[PDB]
């Protein structure tokens, strides 16, 4: 089985910027799809951004042109850099791998 570890921040003022990282190990990191999903306390899970084998990154609907994502081959880790925070964006955020029916991490809430 693969393993994944999420590193993230906590509570920061609205309108700022941050970066999040998820460490994934134990598998073929170079090709598999990696993605980040967010879940509100009431609303269900929702996707945020995704990367593929050809670095064909995508940002779903709400933060198109606002957020960015990249992965480090040597470090075997993915970076997730954030900007222009909003109070409505406070929810439960997870790093995910190998599509939606794959694997999930512990995660960390962000405010």
């Amino acid at each position: 089985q693969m393993q994944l570890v999420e590193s993230g921040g906590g509570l920061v003022q609205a309108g700022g910027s941050l970066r999040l990282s998820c460490a994934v190990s134990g598998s073929i990191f170079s090709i598999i799809t990696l993605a980040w999903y967010r879940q509100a306390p009431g609303k269900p899970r929702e996707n945020v951004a995704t990367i593929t084998r050809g670095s064909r990154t995508s940002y779903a609907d709400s933060v198109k042109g606002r957020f960015c994502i990249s992965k480090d081959n040597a470090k075997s880790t993915v970076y997730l850099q954030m900007n222009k925070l909003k109070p409505e964006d406070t929810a439960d955020y997870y790093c995910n791998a190998e599509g939606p029916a794959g694997y999930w991490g512990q995660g960390t809430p962000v405010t």
Binding site: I32, R53, E98, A101
Partner: peptide, 24 residues
């Protein structure tokens, strides 16, 4: 699969939201 390995797994109704490779 992509050329050597499982890439992303899911259900067609709950995958298109996750742009990934299958939608691409």
């Amino acid at each position: 699969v992509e050329d050597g390995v499982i890439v992303e797994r899911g259900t067609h109704n709950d995958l298109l939201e996750h742009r990934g490779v299958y939608a691409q």
